Structure formats: structure tokens, C-alpha cells
Amino acid sequence: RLSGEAFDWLLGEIESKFNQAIAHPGEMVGALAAQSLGEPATQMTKNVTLGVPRLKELINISKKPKTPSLTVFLLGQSARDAERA
Amino acid sequence: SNRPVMGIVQDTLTAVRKFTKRDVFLERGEVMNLLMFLSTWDGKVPQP
Amino acid sequence: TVINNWLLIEGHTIGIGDSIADSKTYQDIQNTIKKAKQDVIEVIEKAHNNELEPTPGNTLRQTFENQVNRILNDARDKTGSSAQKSLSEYNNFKSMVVSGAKGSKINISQVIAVVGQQNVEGKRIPFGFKHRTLPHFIKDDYGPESRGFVENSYLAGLTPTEFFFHAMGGREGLIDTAVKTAETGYIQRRLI
Amino acid sequence: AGILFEDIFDVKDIDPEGKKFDRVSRLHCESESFKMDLILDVNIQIYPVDLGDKFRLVIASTLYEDGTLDDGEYNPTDDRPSRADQFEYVMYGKVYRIEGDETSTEAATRLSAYVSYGGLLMRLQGDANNLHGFEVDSRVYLLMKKLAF
Amino acid sequence: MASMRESDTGLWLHNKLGATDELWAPPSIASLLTAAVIDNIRLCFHGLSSAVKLKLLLGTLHLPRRTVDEMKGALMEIIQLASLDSDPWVLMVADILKSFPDTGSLNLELEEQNPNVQDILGELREKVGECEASAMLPLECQYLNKNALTTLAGPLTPPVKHFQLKRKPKSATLRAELLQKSTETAQ
Amino acid sequence: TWRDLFYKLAEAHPDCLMLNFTVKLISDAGYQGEITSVSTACQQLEVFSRVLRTSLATILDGGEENLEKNLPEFAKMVCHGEHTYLFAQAMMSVLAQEEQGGSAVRRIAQEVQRFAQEKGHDASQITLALGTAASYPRACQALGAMLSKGALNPADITVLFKMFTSMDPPPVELIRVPAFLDLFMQSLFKPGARINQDHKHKYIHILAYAASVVETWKKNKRVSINKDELKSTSKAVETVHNLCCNENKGASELVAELSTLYQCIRFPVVAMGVLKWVDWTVSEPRYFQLQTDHTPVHLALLDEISTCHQLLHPQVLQLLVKLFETEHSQLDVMEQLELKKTLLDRMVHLLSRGYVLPVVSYIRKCLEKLDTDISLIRYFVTEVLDVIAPPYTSDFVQLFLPILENDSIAGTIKTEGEHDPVTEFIAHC
Amino acid sequence: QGIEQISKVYMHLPQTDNKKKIIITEDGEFKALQEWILETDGVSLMRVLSEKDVDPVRTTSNDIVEIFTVLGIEAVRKALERELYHVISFDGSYVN
């Protein structure tokens, strides 16, 4: 139920806030990403081995992980009747 | 994570939960004593 | 500034009186624990008569442990819920938990209702001795109190065996704290 | 006069869900003439009420019989005549919501106005022809007095 | 609220109560009945239609007793003046409602030069006397007990007994089986 | 067709004289019945009164079996106008003044009142003013307020408790309005509805005094009051209400207290309370999934209800009809068949206890309606003729012969045996 | 019978809606469906993907090197994204 003056003010505010939201040249986003990844790492921990060991496996690309696995989705009607799966 | 890192904690949090209940009533003396601590107060006492 | 000065008028504390049930919730908790013990005894009896159908994808020992853990967790959750229902509006644990300032409902449950079941490496207490966990027990006992289920509450005090099992469960936290610091810093160093 | 609403109610019920708070009670009330229903919080510690009690409710937009407006600031040392002299219980709140049975085509017939008295809420519900002075974001008073009859 | 004049009062009454489709008195009669309108009816009642008088009489009862107490004289006066019209309907309703301002209840007098009333009363009384036993109990009787029903209408009357049963129904078998199950599970 | 067209034309334009002319000529030709008369009888005094007389006489001719048919149209014409409603109530209540034979009169008056209420039209206060409410203004106020709102408020409940507990109780019949007792039952028995715990005992006491207490009256004057069923009745109602509103307990715990349950179910009001409580619980589409017995205890409670009282047999039949007619698509057909067989057992039990004719008619309607499996009616009729014994009345034989006339029974129940139910029944005729 | 490196296979019905099949209906809702899925314990991703009546679209492999070698560089980038998101948002913590 907005009025014309309210709508004009709303458009001005939206444009101002969006222009404020742009990134700033010179920001060291690499260090920000590194810290935003590392800081949460200090509070977490069939088998999937989640947590810091999984982070090490992903970071250090290891030709053999601890628990490799595949999730397979059945294509035809076999996805419905376990007998034909 | 686009969220605050500083929040109200400890006794301040507990007492602000207790403070804003529906049945917290203050006489004028305590209201003046509390308003003495607002740095941004405009000097007008609200209607009770 | 405002709240810390209204608190001088209101005040806030915690004490023994804030960790007491009404002597009618105690009976409910005792009945729940008795029923849990009866259920685990029944499962053990049905196990030793080979009347236990293995759970899909689980061995016989695995499914036995699964039913045992399910019963014990049900007992702990029910006793904790009863303890929460028992608390008054003037209790201090409840006031400090509902505001999120400190603690959580599990802490209230462990202080009032029951400490719960101890674990190491995600499993019950292992047979450190030959086919038993302590010299005070008997060979090949898989009952609740012989594998680390702390029946009492922090208020009511722990019996010797439960105290030792609690110490075992506690040591794991210290070890994890020791290793997590050593790993996370290196990870972040390599990232940066 | 600035008298938005005035009618007689009786306490047909007390807080049904239970005593949530020590010093506050939830009153369910029904009117007599307009056949209104009311949901109110009162400071039960200083203005005790009982089941079956009757009171005169006078929701006024101002406390001055002449009809002038007020800044809304506490000025206890005031001399002008006030409606509060003939009433026992007075609140001062701010209506925050006005519901109704509105459709996409025709107007509403049964309205519902909610006003919050510094935390103590109140819902006034009835027919559209009475709740005309209620407009959102406006300060009002309560001015209720028990009727011993 | 003004003493709007006689013919104008009749026009207002026939505007608020003139809906012939709405044969029921509106709930608005709680606020529509005031001192001025009732007082002005003392002369414009002749200008009201029979339906208007009937609906006004029906709506007179839908008032709070505080209003009735503070409008004793006006209500009795309007009843008396409505008891002097050509319509027998308004006469009877005024006589029935004369008791409302005094006791809050309604008078019950009948058998007075009303052929339909007398004939209906007589035929229904004799018909009930034919089949006192064959009386359909009110809806409250299914809650009442044996003594209450006996005091109200007398002893329970059995229906027609079609035949006899040589084999017990499955209801008793289920009752005994569930009693055994409850005894076993409880103990 | 042209008569209806002429009616529409006449209603369309009031200004044309031809339309009134044609209406008058239609009346002259003998087709004035086509002219509207549903709202005309309200404006007519004598014609409406005489048609009311004939309708009520026909109602009393056939008892309930013809009242159920003559009641809709009669109630429509009576309650279409409020003035006719009020005069009908006044005359009918004056008829009810006599203490002998007044039960049917009060029932018909209550039927008119409830039909008027169904249209959203309220006259409860006038109904109270018609009776003896004058001597008790406070009770009149409380009943009027509750029946106007349609809800129970604790304040007026407490006022009535104070009045009735005092040494001068009012006529108990005034608080026995079907709507008012229905309000008590709904508030005290409906799952999901909450009532104050501090007034629960007062509600129970008021209901018990309303139902079980018996008062002696002569010439509209009180004589004595029976209070035999006041303490035990209140205790039974309290226990049953505790069972009803403490729903989180499983049905097994309900069965575990079967001695007390069956002891307390013998009260007819409590029997209706558990009847409707079970009705509302099983009315949930997902309740059947939670009901894990091929012969559930709920139908056993219904059997006990039917055994205890015959007044509830119409209500038991109605609930059984609702249960059987409800076709479920979220259950396996195997459990549907089990439930239908158990419901057939319940219908057999109801037919056994003397409530036969409506049950027989409903069973025949289901057999002819194809909404019931052939094997279901096979089992029903076979077990009925198994448990029942000759001689059979002319009414039962007449109503049961077309049931065996259907081929679904003639080709199934007729089997080669020395005691064949269909063959023996046919030979009995 | 079978292929090597696959020690064991679990037939599993998903409970969370993440692995559940999602198809927009005719009228426009989402209407999550539940279908059988399998979890191996080794990595082939090539013989497995080429099997008859096995969906070649949604069959991920949880192994970074295998995903890279089978499906390129952008696929391994997306897989790394999803793996990191899972290992981070497992405990409820959220990272931009």
C-alpha cells in the first residue's frame, strides 16, 4: 500500500545500499578466505570420517583417501522395487 | 559469516531476559536512577 | 550500563535449592531407571537364548549393542525431560539456560536427573581386563552398570565404579583438546 | 471529548492458559450493549479483580476534557482537570494492529484492534461501526473503573 | 437520538424492519431500541405494518435487563398501546410480554377466543392421551438416569420383541476375551 | 414450465398488472400451489396453524418412524418466520405443562428450537423466559449468557454452582436444555479442548447435578430432591473425563482399567460421553493407523454401551453407520475388510438386543447400494440367522425376505447343509 | 561376478531430502520423492557409471582424484566445493 513519496524514497535507499555493498579494490580477500576457512576448523571433530582429517584429505589432495565411496542412483523403475535393485 | 561477532553476554544477558518480562514494574525513583546511566538520553521522561 | 545497575535491585544467584526435585519427580526418575534396567536384562536374556534376530546390515553383537544403547538413551532422555518439567519458575538454572547465557538443558538433566552413559571412542567401556571392565565385576557381563552407565546424578554423588568410568570418559576430552590445537594451526598456516 | 470508546464489561473469565506471570493476569471480558469481547492484561497486584466483576471501560485519546493534545511526557505537576480523577485504573499505550474480516471486494464488518500498554497487550474485537477512532500508531488511554452497582 | 416525529418514526421503523424476506428479527434490535423511538411509537404504531409490529415485539425481548430496568415505563406503555390494535397477533404478544418488565419471564394464557389455539391444544392433548407410552423422549433423556426418567415420563417402555436368541452374541465373547486380556496384561 | 416462467416474470417486475392478473388466474385454475407458499404461511395465521395441526397429528400417528419424515418440512415452515416460531413454542410449552405425557411434547418443542438454531437464528433467552426462570434471575442470566455465546465461562459456572449448592436450587429441567448439556459434553469430552483445572470439579459437579439428580414435582411445585447419584456419579464422571482428556496415554492403559471403566460406563450420560469421545477420536483419518486391533476395544465399549441402555441404540446405530460408510484410501484393503467384518459383528449385536428395524433397513440399503462387499453381507446374514431363533414376527419376516431375495445372498449363503439358514428361514414362511 | 575395488554395497532409502529425488509436478509443486540408492566402499566411477540401468547424471564419487580424472577440471572444482561445504556445514556452522 505504499505511496509515491514512499516508493521514491525506497528506490533511493535501495540504490544507496547496493552501491555501498560493492567490494573495495585493494582488499586482501585471499587472507580473508584463508582465515574464514581456518577459524571454524578449531571447533568440529557408514563411516565417512568427517572433520579435521577430512579437511586434511581435501586440502592435501591424496591419491588414496581413508574411506572412499560412491553414491549410486538407480535410473529406471529399479529405483523403486528393492527386488530389482 | 555476515553476522555480528559481539553480543550481550553473562549477567547482562540474564538480567535483560529477566528485565523485559511482562510483569517488571519500576517506580519513579528507580526509573530516574536507571535513566541517569543512558548516555544517549534526550532528557525527557516517558509517560508511565 | 542500564542492565548492570538494575541487576543491583533485582539480583541473581544459584545454589543447592536450585538443584533439588520435589521428591515426587525422584520417584518417577527411579521408576524410569528401574524399567531401563529391566529392559536391558530382558534383551540380554533373549540374546543368550539365541532369540535375537540380527538387525539388517549388523552383526549379532552390533545389533545387541544397538538395542542396549537405544534403551539407555531413551531412559536418559525421559529422565531429563521429567527433570525439566519439574523445575519451577524461580529456579536459577532454568533462568540462565532459557536466556542462553550459560549452560544447556543437558547440564540441568545431568545435575538433577542422571549423569548418563560414558563412552570411549564412541563405544561403551571396553573390557580392559580379561572379559570384564573392573575386578569388582564378573566375567562376560554386558549389563548397564558394568559397562559405564552412570545411574546417579551429580547432586546425588557417584559410586566408585561410576566415578572411575566418568574419569575415563573425561580423559578423552583432554586428549582431543591437546591434539586439535596442534592440527588446526598448521592447517590455517598452510592455507594462508 | 476524544472518547474513542465507552462501554460496560464483566469479567467472564480469568487467565485460562494458567498463571504465566505473578503480577499480571489475562482478563477475558464480554460487553453488554455492543456485544464486544475484550482480552486485557492488568497489574493484578495493585488493582485486584475477581470473576463476575463489572467495570466501565473508557478508551480516550486524551486525558483532558477540553480536548487538547498532549506531548506524551510525564509531567506530574499538572493542574488541568483530568478524566483520571473519576477512574481507578489508567494505562497509556499505543495501538499497533487492526485486523478485520476484509475481503478483496467488500469492506469489513467485524474488526479487532490491538493496543500495547508498555508491554501489557489488549485486544478489542467487535463490529466495524464502533472501532472508528482506532488508527494504527496512535497513543490512547484505558481509564477503567470497577462498578459495584 | 432525537424525538423524530410520528410519521417519520414509522418510516424509520419500516426502513429498519421492512425486509419482508427477513422474517426474523435482526440482532441489531439490541441497539435499535431506544427511549425516543419507543416513545414516538405511541402514535405511529397505527402507521406500522403488521410485520413491523410483529418484528418489533420479537425484538423487544432481545434486550439486557439493565436496559429493561431503566426502560420499565416506556416498555410497559408500548406493550399497552400495542395491545389496542386490529391485529390479534399484537394483542396476544402484548399480553404475553406484559410479564417481562415485572418478572423477566413470559405469561402463558390460552383458550381465549382463539379457535386455532383451542383446537390445536385439544387435539394434541387427546392425541398424547391416546399414546402416553408412545412418547418420544426429549434429547436430555439420553443423559438422564432411571429415576429421573421415571419421574419425568415414567418407566422405560420396551420395544417390540421380535424373537428369542438361542446363541449368545459376539459382544459377550469380545467382552470376556478383552477382560481376560486386561487381566493378563495388568498382571 | 410456463407456470414457473410466469412466477419468475411476476417476481421480476412489480409494476406490471398482467403478472398479478396471471397469478390470480393460475390460482383460479387450481394451480395456486405453484405460487410461493413457503414464506406465505408465515404471513397467514389460520392456514399455518391448521397445517401445523395436521403435521403434528401425522407426527404422532407414526411415532418416531414418521416424525423423522414429517419433521423437516414442518420445522422449515414453522421456523421460517420468527413470530410463528414463538407462537409454536408458546403453545407447545403450554402443552408440556401437564406432567402426564409431556415428554413427547417437550421433545417436539426442543426439535423446533434446535431447527431454529440450525439456521443461525437464536431465541434461547425467549425460551428461558417462557419457562420458570423468573424466580431465579441469576440462573436465568447465566444460562442466557452461555447459550447466547455458545460457550461455557468459568464465572457463570461458579455462579450456578453457588446457586445450586445453596439450599434453594432451581428447577433442574431448565438446565437440561439439549444445547446446554451438549456444551458440557463438548467441553468435558472433546480431545484437544482445554478447560480450567481450578474449575474442573465445579464443572463436573454441575453436570452431575444436572443429569443424575432427581426432583419430585407436583402442580408445578417442588416436593423432594433425590441425591443418591451425586458422589459416585461425580467420581465416575471425573474418572472418565480424566481418561478422555489425558489422551497421550495409549489405549492399552485404557483397557488396563477395565473394571472401573465398565463400572462407570453404566451411567447413561457418561455412556454418551464416551460414545462421542470415541466418535471424535476415531473420526480422525489417522486414528485407524494408530488402532492396531482387528477387533478394537472401542467397538467393545460400544457393545457395552448398547447392552447397558436401549436409549443409545439409535445413537449406536448412527455411529456404526458413520463408521461403516467411511471408506478409507490410506489403509490396506485387508485392514478395511477386518474393520468392516468387526463392524458387521457390532451391527449383529445391535440387531440382537431388540434394535432391529432401522438396522435391518440400513443393512438392506447397504446391500442394494453396492457399498458393501458380497462376503460382508454373507457373513452378516449367516451369523444373524445363526444367533437368532424362531418364531419371527411379521414385521421382521417382511423386512428380511427381500434381503434374502437379493442374488448376492441366494447364491452364497444357500449351501448344502442339513440346517441351512436361508432355507430354514424360507421354510418358516 | 561384479567389479573389483568394491568391498561391499549398501542398499539404502534416503531419509533427508538432500538425496531424495526432486521433480516439479504438473501443477508446479516440488513433491520430494524417495527412491533406492546405493553406497559402495571403493572407487571405480567408470565401470560403475557405464552399468546398465544406473543413472549417469547424479552418480557422484566422493573421491577428488577419481572425479578429476573421469570428468575434467570444472567437475572436480564443483565436487571440491560440495565436499568442503559438507565438511564445514556438517555441525551446523555456516561459512560464506
CB atoms within 10 A of CB F232: 14
Chain B contacts of G96, Cβ < 8 Å?
A: 1-2
Q: Which of F149, F154, F194 sits opposite D51 (nearest CB)?
A: F154
> How far apart are the C-alpha atoms of C118 and C149, rounded to whole Å?
6
Q: Three-state DSSP class for D43? A: strand
What secondary structure letter does DSSP report for A39? G
User: Which pairs from C174-180 meet CB under 8 Å and 24+ separation?
Assistant: C180/A42, C180/A52
Chain-centroid distance of CA F273 in Å reads 13
Determine A/E contact with 3+ CB pairs under 8 A as the test: no
Chain C residues with CB under 8 Å of A34 CB are 188, 191-192
Pairing of strands A71-73, G37-39: antiparallel
Breaks in chain A, after residue numbers (C to N greater than 2.5 Å)? 45
The Cα–Cα gap between B2 and D58 comes to 49
Q: Could you tell me if B1 lies within 8 Å of chain G, comparing CB atoms?
A: yes
- Give the three cell numbers for residue C37: 534396567
Q: For the purposes of burial, counting CB atoms within 10 Å of the CB of F103, is it exposed (0-12), middle (13-18) or buried (19 or more)? A: buried
Give the number of residues written for chain B: 48
Angle, helices F17-29/F2-12, rounded to nearest 10 degrees? 140
Instruction: Count other Cβ atoms within 10 Å, centred on residue C146.
Output: 19
Placement of cell 415428554 in the chain: F103
Q: Are D149 and D10 in contact (CB under 8 A)?
A: no
Contact C83, C109 (CB under 8 A): yes
β-pairing, D92-100 vs D24-31, is unpaired
- Cis peptide bond N-terminal to E159, omega within 30: no
Give me F8's grid cell.
Answer: 419468475
Place of cell 404461511: F41
Angle at E164 between CA E158 and CA E170, to 5 degrees: 95
Specify the experimental method: cryo-EM
**Are G62 and A72 an interchain contact pair (Cβ–Cβ within 8 Å)?**
no
- Distance from F202 to chain E by nearest Cα, in Å? 18
SS3 F70: helix
Rounded Cα distance, F41 and F83, in Å? 11
Q: Which of residues 122-181 of E touch F (CB under 8 A)?
A: 123-125, 127-132, 134-145, 147-148, 151-153, 156, 158-171, 174-175, 178-179, 181
Helices B28-35 and C2-10 sit at what angle, rounded to 10 degrees?
150
Residue D89 in contact with residue D140, Cβ under 8 Å?
A: no
Can you say whether the dihedral through the CA atoms of F306, F312, F314, F320 is positive or negative?
A: negative
> How far apart, in whole angstroms, are the C-alpha atoms of residue A64 and residue A79?
30
Residue F413 CA to residue F399 CA, distance in Å, equals 18
Residues of B in contact with G94 (CB under 8 A): 1
Interface of F with E in 116-145 (CB under 8 A): 121, 125-126, 129-134, 137, 140-141
* A5 three-state secondary structure: helix
Q: For chain C, give the DSSP string.
A: -HHHHHHHHH-----GGGG---SSHHHHHHHHHHHHHHHHHHHHHHHHTT--PPPTT--HHHHHHHHHHHHHHHHHHHHHHHHHHH--TT-HHHHHHHTTSS--HHHHHHHHT--EE--BTTBS----SSSSSSTTS-SS---STTTTEE-S-TTT---HHHHHHHHHHHHHHHHHHHHHHHHHHHHHHHH-
Nearest neighbour of A65 by CB, restricted to G53, G63, G84:
G63
End-to-end CA distance of chain G: 46
Compute how many other C-beta atoms are within 10 angstroms of the C-beta atom of residue F62: 13
Q: Are C133 and C147 in contact (CB under 8 A)?
A: yes
Question: Do F35 and F4 contact (CB within 8 A), yes or no?
Answer: no
Please answer yes or no on whether G59 and A54 come within 8 Å at the CB atom.
Answer: no
Give the residue from B14, B30, B35 with the most C CB atoms within 10 Å of its CB, the best one to mutate: B14
* Spatial distance between the Cα atoms of F90 and F158, rounded to a whole number of angstroms: 31
CB G21 within 8 A of CB G15: no
D73 near B CB under 8 A: yes
D33: chain E residues, CB-CB within 8 Å:
30-31, 64, 67
CATH of span D5-148: 2.40.50.140
Phi, psi (5° rounding) for residue G31?
55, 70
N residues, chain A: 85
Contact in structure between F188 and F204 (CB atoms under 8 Å)? yes
Domain spans of chain D, in order of start: 5-148
The C-alpha atoms of residue G49 and residue G66 are separated, in whole angstroms, by 12
Q: Give dist(CA G50, CA F100) in Å, integer.
A: 92
CA C92 to chain centroid? 22
Maximum separation of any 2 CA atoms in chain A, in Å = 67
User: What is the CA E146 to chain-centroid distance, rounded?
Assistant: 28
What chains are in contact with D, requiring at least 3 Cβ pairs below 8 Å?
B, E, F
Nearest-CA neighbor of A53 among C183, C173, G42? C183
Give, in degrees to the nearest 5, the angle at Cα F269 between F266 and F275. 85
In degrees rounded to 5, what are phi and psi of residue F226? -85, 125
Would you call B2 and G96 a contact, using CB atoms and an 8 Å cutoff? yes
Cα separation, F190 vs F279, in Å, equals 10
**Residues pairing with C123 in the sheet:** C120
Residues E24 and E17: their CA atoms lie apart, in Å, by: 10
Q: Would you call C187 and A56 a contact, using CB atoms and an 8 Å cutoff?
A: yes
* B2 has a chain G CB within 8 A of its CB: yes
Chains C and F touch (3+ CB pairs under 8 A): no
The nearest CA of chain D is from the CA of E29 a distance in Å of 10
| Contacts with E161 (C-beta within 8 Å, 6 or more apart), sequence order | F354
Name chain F contacts of E25, Cβ cutoff 8 Å.
Answer: 82
